[PDB]
Design an enzyme around this catalytic site. Structure first.
Site, mmCIF file in Angstrom:
data_model
loop_
_atom_site.group_PDB
_atom_site.id
_atom_site.type_symbol
_atom_site.label_atom_id
_atom_site.label_comp_id
_atom_site.label_asym_id
_atom_site.label_seq_id
_atom_site.Cartn_x
_atom_site.Cartn_y
_atom_site.Cartn_z
ATOM 1 N N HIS A 133 0.860 -1.216 0.000
ATOM 2 C CA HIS A 133 0.000 0.000 0.000
ATOM 3 C C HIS A 133 0.881 1.246 0.000
ATOM 4 C CE1 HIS A 133 -3.584 -2.361 1.810
ATOM 5 N NE2 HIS A 133 -3.166 -2.814 0.623
ATOM 6 N N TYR A 185 1.755 -6.629 6.233
ATOM 7 C CA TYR A 185 1.780 -7.310 4.891
ATOM 8 C C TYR A 185 3.149 -7.951 4.648
ATOM 9 C CZ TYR A 185 -2.801 -5.401 3.510
ATOM 10 O OH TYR A 185 -4.162 -5.152 3.447
HETATM 11 C C1 LIG Z 1 -2.352 -5.701 7.127
HETATM 12 C C2 LIG Z 1 -3.314 -6.834 6.893
HETATM 13 O O1 LIG Z 1 -4.531 -6.642 6.947
HETATM 14 N N1 LIG Z 1 -2.758 -8.041 6.638
HETATM 15 C C3 LIG Z 1 -3.575 -9.231 6.368
HETATM 16 C C4 LIG Z 1 -4.013 -10.136 7.568
HETATM 17 O O2 LIG Z 1 -4.451 -9.390 8.709
HETATM 18 C C5 LIG Z 1 -3.446 -9.473 9.746
HETATM 19 O O3 LIG Z 1 -3.424 -10.808 10.280
HETATM 20 C C6 LIG Z 1 -4.463 -11.152 11.235
HETATM 21 C C7 LIG Z 1 -4.707 -12.531 11.637
HETATM 22 O O4 LIG Z 1 -4.495 -12.827 12.841
HETATM 23 O O5 LIG Z 1 -5.125 -13.342 10.776
HETATM 24 C C8 LIG Z 1 -5.210 -10.210 11.796
HETATM 25 C C9 LIG Z 1 -5.081 -8.759 11.410
HETATM 26 O O6 LIG Z 1 -6.143 -8.656 10.462
HETATM 27 C C10 LIG Z 1 -3.703 -8.409 10.821
HETATM 28 O O7 LIG Z 1 -2.594 -8.272 11.777
HETATM 29 C C11 LIG Z 1 -5.075 -11.163 7.103
HETATM 30 O O8 LIG Z 1 -6.322 -10.485 6.754
HETATM 31 C C12 LIG Z 1 -4.422 -11.970 5.927
HETATM 32 C C13 LIG Z 1 -5.317 -13.107 5.360
HETATM 33 O O9 LIG Z 1 -4.835 -13.680 4.104
HETATM 34 O O10 LIG Z 1 -3.919 -11.057 4.887
HETATM 35 C C14 LIG Z 1 -2.880 -10.223 5.441
HETATM 36 O O11 LIG Z 1 -2.094 -9.555 4.485
HETATM 37 C C1 LIG Z 2 -10.238 -1.580 -1.673
HETATM 38 C C2 LIG Z 2 -9.524 -0.797 -0.567
HETATM 39 O O1 LIG Z 2 -10.035 -0.405 0.476
HETATM 40 N N1 LIG Z 2 -8.226 -0.561 -0.688
HETATM 41 C C3 LIG Z 2 -7.403 -1.055 -1.766
HETATM 42 C C4 LIG Z 2 -6.389 -2.121 -1.300
HETATM 43 O O2 LIG Z 2 -7.019 -3.426 -1.023
HETATM 44 C C5 LIG Z 2 -7.041 -3.758 0.415
HETATM 45 O O3 LIG Z 2 -5.815 -4.341 0.817
HETATM 46 C C6 LIG Z 2 -5.661 -5.685 0.264
HETATM 47 C C7 LIG Z 2 -4.343 -6.234 -0.153
HETATM 48 O O4 LIG Z 2 -4.329 -7.318 -0.721
HETATM 49 O O5 LIG Z 2 -3.232 -5.689 0.014
HETATM 50 C C8 LIG Z 2 -6.763 -6.476 0.102
HETATM 51 C C9 LIG Z 2 -8.192 -6.058 0.380
HETATM 52 O O6 LIG Z 2 -8.912 -6.060 -0.854
HETATM 53 C C10 LIG Z 2 -8.225 -4.649 0.900
HETATM 54 O O7 LIG Z 2 -8.270 -4.835 2.302
HETATM 55 C C11 LIG Z 2 -5.182 -2.173 -2.279
HETATM 56 O O8 LIG Z 2 -5.527 -2.665 -3.590
HETATM 57 C C12 LIG Z 2 -4.519 -0.760 -2.238
HETATM 58 C C13 LIG Z 2 -3.251 -0.567 -3.111
HETATM 59 O O9 LIG Z 2 -2.469 0.557 -2.586
HETATM 60 O O10 LIG Z 2 -5.428 0.343 -2.481
HETATM 61 C C14 LIG Z 2 -6.862 0.260 -2.300
HETATM 62 O O11 LIG Z 2 -7.620 0.480 -3.520
#
Ligand SMILES: CC(=O)N[C@@H]1[C@@H](O[C@@H]2OC(C(=O)O)=C[C@H](O)[C@H]2O)[C@@H](O)[C@@H](CO)O[C@H]1O
Ligand SMILES: CC(=O)N[C@@H]1[C@@H](O[C@@H]2OC(C(=O)O)=C[C@H](O)[C@H]2O)[C@@H](O)[C@@H](CO)O[C@H]1O
Ligand SMILES: [Mg+2]
Length: 966
Positions: free
Chosen positions: A450, A457
């Site tokens: 992001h 991430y």
């Molecule tokens: C930053 C983010 O949203 N990362 C995603 C994961 O969320 C993290 O992991 C967990 C968890 O205990 O599963 C909880 C919190 O949401 C955060 O610290 C999770 O959504 C994951 C699933 O594929 O994707 C990560 O990138």
């Molecule tokens: C849709 C939104 O709220 N944000 C977009 C981002 O997606 C999020 O993060 C991820 C991920 O895989 O990293 C997954 C989920 O769809 C969502 O929580 C991402 O595409 C971002 C790129 O900078 O920007 C937003 O459009």
């Protein structure tokens, strides 16, 4: 199916579905002479029956149904995102047909009589057809006829049809395949291939078959996002509930399979109750492919051969059902977006079942299928190294699924070529500095998603790229050293800024749910054990420290004795999130700023609503362990009072982000962040500047906040603090932490205070200790409030109200309407006795430190305990100092005179890039007083002084030991 027309203005969102589980089910159907229409109860999508259509060529049956076909506008408004109305049905061929089914739509149609489309019938199994009725034909409003016409050019034949459906669908997601043409195509993967190629040898083939095995090892002896089931009696019972029976002359009958995304076309929530009860007997691909993988693990570990055999059969029947349902090469299934979610464990399941699939003669269909549906990931899977190839989601959710698809290639020479290429891909992907804010590792150890450093991430990316290099280690497919060196910079860096959770400042959109190094521990082992000179001791000592293992345990694991790592000591700059880490004893201080290139915060529709101050010159002190135990409790947390931070104390309705969905507020200039000296010492420089006109953001709010970290202490100063409202509610937070039976005790000038509530105010010469043993001496302030009190707050997801009791202390800056300031000093090893001595030293002419300059241009803090000076050039300036004379750019400079050497460090935390452009190195002239000689820093003596040329790249500090010229 009701007598109400399709897309009824009255109920626009309600799918009309011909599924034949109603009465006189063929009332709305008429055939011509040369077609017959029956129901078969032998295969079906929805209900348990399908339209058996027997036909001479040229023949036609008509579906009599009124369609009030909307515009792309009407349907977009009805739903809330770009939309279209979609015609969609399933058909089964028992035998291929050389020609085209015509679907035509018009008014009061018969055999002989607007617009329509074509389905190539050259296939067997189920296929799904899915057209936009506004964009994919060759329309009026007054349509009541949908006429299916068998090809002229075939003499006769037979087609099963089910689930003819008019519905409102997402207009991104009707995809072209080998049956139907749409405006939309997702192009098929075209594998890059690197030269020179590796040859099929027994050596190179053994590496491949070993890589497959090392992979199987990892999934048969706990993974996030995998609903693991080891209990066979449960797998059996789950499989039975599918009712898959093999049919006499090819293919299956069983419960229909659908992805999480495919169900959109039905618009489930608006479905008539007849249709929702049938939609409920569908199975979700994710659960199906989870059961397949759970079965494949069970099979690989099963000792009893009768049961081992039953597991193989289950898996094979599930594979066959899956392909008969039309999950095969050339079948789009209208769409399969977010395929990863529905199928990630199918990829891995083929590794464990490579041999069974070979014997059953399914390996070629199953590879063809996974390869088709993988076209979604074409920009990673094609394996050409681009600016986007360092994506941290792919390393998490796609990298092993990618390798698994490669290893399923039938031809041995093609397999080696793909795995050879996939090694050069992964190497490039972890080696390159991506331009701008593109994902991936960076030269200072940060790791971006992001468009910014993002532990949440990177941590799962670090674990799976570590595991990837380990699967390929010591083979000709082994990852390049460059990629290994760089992943290691990043993971040593994560050990430094964790303790063992990352700080609140690095929690991203998830405050109080910081990622842990604990979930990335296996990675320290995989990476140690995959070094060119294995095992890497550094990484091994981290693995032992994080996984909670003794020196005694190390020899078995790593094959020589390695002492578990003691917690990093000193200071580490990380200007990729405009932060620095001070470590002393078991404590980490996360100092965070922000700027043009570093967002303050990530705030989404339902994450981090109250996040505005996440990076406002903060300095969160965390001792080794749980932050919640140290009172970083979200319930009743005062979001205004992030430790270290200068903020305006808003109500939550107004601290809430102005944008109701997404804001990632970037700073107003390039310069803010940290710099290091001798790896022992740091200075933060933060220029707080607000946007000229963003809602809820005081345009005139400003501060210059500097911090100099050395050994057990930190000096905090402030200057040029201003608001629109003469500093009304402008506070600098010393600390905030929950009150618990364990965190019970505040100290003020030698006095224990355990009272709830309690308020008092302090000034210069006063001191406190919090319940975590951090002491604050107040060295220049008028008015420092202290509070023990019940606080009411709201949680960062759905703003629901919380509460709890907190100890808190802050500088009230409203007693200085114009250019408010502060100084205070944090002791990390504090006790009432040592703070009383620290206070005595303060009263003796300040023998703790001297501020040599404190204004809009420069802060200069001389630390008299460390004999270190920090220089925060907020602007280029000439100064008066013993050492530094002139800096021609905004910069952070540091000096330490040691016996007969002068050590100078310099940097600009300015990364000197944009979201698109790649960073370039800023050249910083530091003149210093007097003559010196001596590291990539250049020095020229000019007159009676010395010009230093520091090269600042991605805010990585440089330094130079000089000795004095006679
Ligand atoms: C930053 C983010 O949203 N990362 C995603 C994961 O969320 C993290 O992991 C967990 C968890 O205990 O599963 C909880 C919190 O949401 C955060 O610290 C999770 O959504 C994951 C699933 O594929 O994707 C990560 O990138
Ligand atoms: C849709 C939104 O709220 N944000 C977009 C981002 O997606 C999020 O993060 C991820 C991920 O895989 O990293 C997954 C989920 O769809 C969502 O929580 C991402 O595409 C971002 C790129 O900078 O920007 C937003 O459009
Ligand atoms: Mg049916």
């Amino acid at each position: 199916a009701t007598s109400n027309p399709a897309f009824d203005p009255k109920n626009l969102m309600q799918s009309e579905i011909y599924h034949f589980a109603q009465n006189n089910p063929l009332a709305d159907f008429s055939s011509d002479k040369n077609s017959i229409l029956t129901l078969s109860d032998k295969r079906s999508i929805m209900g348990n029956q399908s339209l058996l259509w027997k036909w001479k060529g040229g023949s036609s049956f008509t579906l009599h149904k009124k369609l009030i076909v909307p515009t792309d506008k009407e349907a977009s408004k009805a739903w809330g995102r770009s939309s279209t109305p979609v015609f969609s049905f399933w058909l089964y061929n028992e035998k291929p047909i050389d020609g085209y089914l015509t679907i035509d739509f018009g008014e009061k149609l018969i055999s002989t009589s607007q617009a329509g489309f074509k389905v190539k019938l050259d296939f067997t199994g189920w296929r799904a057809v899915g057209v936009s009725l506004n964009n994919d034909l060759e329309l009026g409003a007054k349509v009541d006829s949908i006429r299916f016409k068998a090809p002229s050019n075939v003499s006769q034949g037979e087609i099963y049809i089910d689930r003819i459906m008019f519905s409102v669908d997402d207009a991104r997601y009707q995809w072209s395949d080998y049956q139907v043409k749409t405006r939309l195509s997702e192009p098929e993967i075209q594998f890059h291939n690197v030269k020179p190629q590796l040859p099929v040898t027994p050596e190179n083939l053994a590496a491949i078959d070993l890589i497959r095995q090392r992979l199987i090892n990892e999934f048969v002896g706990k993974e996030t996002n995998l609903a693991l089931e080891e209990n066979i009696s449960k797998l059996k019972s789950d499989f039975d509930a599918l009712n898959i029976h093999t049919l006499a002359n090819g293919g299956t009958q069983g419960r229909h399979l659908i992805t999480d995304k495919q169900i959109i076309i039905y618009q489930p929530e608006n479905l008539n109750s007849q249709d929702k009860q049938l939609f409920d007997n569908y199975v979700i691909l994710g659960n199906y492919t989870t059961l397949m993988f759970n079965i494949s693990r069970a099979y690989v570990l099963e000792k009893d051969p009768t049961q081992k055999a039953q597991l193989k059969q289950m898996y094979l029947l599930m594979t066959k059902h899956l392909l008969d349902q039309g999950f095969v090469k050339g079948s789009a299934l209208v769409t399969t977006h977010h395929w990863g979610y529905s199928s990630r464990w199918w990829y891995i399941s083929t590794l464990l079942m490579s041999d069974a699939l070979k014997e059953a003669n399914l390996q070629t269909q199953v590879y063809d299928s996974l390869l088709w549906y993988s076209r979604e990931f074409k920009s990673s899977f094609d394996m050409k190294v681009s600016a986007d190839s360092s994506d941290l989601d792919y390393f998490n959710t796609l990298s092993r699924q990618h390798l698994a698809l490669l290893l399923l290639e039938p031809d041995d020479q093609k397999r080696i070529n793909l795995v050879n290429t996939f090694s050069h891909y992964i190497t490039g992907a972890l080696t390159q500095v991506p331009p701008g804010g593109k994902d991936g590792l960076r030269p200072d150890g940060t790791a971006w998603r992001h468009e910014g450093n993002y532990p949440g991430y990177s941590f799962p990316a670090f674990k799976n790229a570590s595991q990837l290099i380990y699967l390929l280690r010591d083979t000709p497919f082994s990852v390049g050293e460059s990629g290994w060196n760089n992943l290691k910079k990043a993971m040593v860096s994560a050990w430094i800024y964790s303790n063992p959770e990352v700080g609140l400042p690095l929690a991203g959109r998830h405050p109080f749910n910081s990622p842990s190094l604990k979930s990335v521990a296996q990675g320290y082992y995989w990476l140690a054990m995959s070094a060119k000179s294995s095992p890497d001791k550094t990484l091994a000592s981290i693995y032992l420290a994080i996984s909670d293992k003794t020196q005694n345990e190390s020899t078995a694991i790593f094959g020589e004795t390695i002492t578990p790592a003691s917690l990093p000591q000193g200071f580490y700059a990380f200007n990729g999130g405009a932060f620095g880490i001070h470590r002393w004893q078991d404590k980490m201080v996360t100092l965070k700023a922000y700027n043009t290139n570093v967002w303050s915060s990530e705030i989404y529709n339902k994450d981090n609503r109250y996040g505005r101050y996440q990076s406002h010159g903060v300095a969160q002190i965390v001792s080794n362990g749980s932050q919640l135990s140290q009172g970083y409790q979200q319930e009743g947390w005062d979001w205004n009072r992030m430790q270290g931070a200068t903020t305006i104390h808003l109500p939550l309705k107004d601290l809430d982000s102005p944008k109701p969905h997404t804001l990632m507020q970037r700073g107003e200039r390039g310069f803010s962040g940290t710099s290091s000296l001798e790896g022992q010492y740091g200075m933060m420089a933060f220029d707080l500047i607000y946007p000229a006109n963003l809602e809820r953001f005081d345009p005139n709010f400003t501060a210059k906040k500097s911090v100099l970290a050395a050994d057990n202490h930190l000096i905090f100063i402030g200057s040029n603090i201003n608001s629109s409202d003469k500093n009304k509610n402008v506070e600098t937070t010393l600390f905030q932490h929950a009150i618990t039976p364990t965190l019970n005790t505040l100290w003020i000038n030698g006095q224990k205070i355990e009272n709830m509530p309690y308020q008092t105010t302090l000034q210069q010469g006063d001191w406190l200790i919090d319940s975590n043993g951090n002491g604050y001496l107040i060295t220049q302030a008028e008015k420092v409030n202290v509070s023990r009190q019940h606080q009411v707050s709201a949680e960062n997801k759905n703003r629901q109200p919380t509460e709890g009791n907190f100890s808190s202390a802050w500088i009230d800056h409203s007693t200085r309407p114009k250019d408010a300031s502060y100084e205070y000093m944090v002791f990390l090893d504090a006790t009432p006795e040592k703070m009383g001595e620290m206070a005595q030293k303060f009263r003796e002419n300040n023998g703790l430190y001297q501020v040599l300059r404190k204004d809009k241009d420069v802060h200069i803090i001389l630390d008299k305990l460390s004999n270190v000076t920090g220089y925060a050039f907020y602007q280029p300036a000439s100064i008066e100092d013993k050492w530094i004379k002139k800096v021609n750019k905004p910069a952070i400079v540091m000096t330490h005179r040691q016996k007969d050497t002068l050590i100078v460090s310099a940097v600009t935390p300015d990364l000197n890039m944009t979201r698109q452009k790649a960073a370039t190195p800023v050249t910083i002239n530091v003149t210093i007083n007097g003559k010196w000689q001596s590291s990539e820093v250049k020095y020229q003596v000019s007159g009676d002084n010395t010009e230093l040329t520091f090269t600042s790249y991605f805010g990585i500090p440089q330094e130079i030991k000089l000795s004095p010229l006679p």
